[PDB]
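Per-record layout

source: Homo sapiens
name: Neural cell adhesion molecule 2
length: 119
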Amino acid sequence: GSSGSSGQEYILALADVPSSPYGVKIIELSQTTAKVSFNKPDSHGGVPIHHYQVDVKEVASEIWKIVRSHGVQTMVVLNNLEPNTTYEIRVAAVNGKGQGDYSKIEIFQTLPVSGPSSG
């Protein structure tokens, strides 16, 4: 029939990448940080997702920053951002196969600095 390593290549070999996530929205937005909460993808690329790839950057800047999570969580907080500024973030599903597709580009604007003294 065949030689070399073979056996578990029935479907796991003809598998595809996971679909783009949904429900993505910023629940906790700050002047410097920004929390992005989303829901699992309506479907997976055959194999179980490993992690999510998030890419955020200023609508004016041309540098995309990649921030990986610490697991299969659908929630991640961003940092190192300027207040009163807007940034475009996109959530994608990355698995053994790879980075399927990016979800509807999201646009969030940090809060305008108010003061360190609770008011």
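summary: The radius of gyration is 18 Å. The beta strands are 22-29, 34-39, 51-58, 65-68, 75-78, 86-95, 98-102, 106-109.
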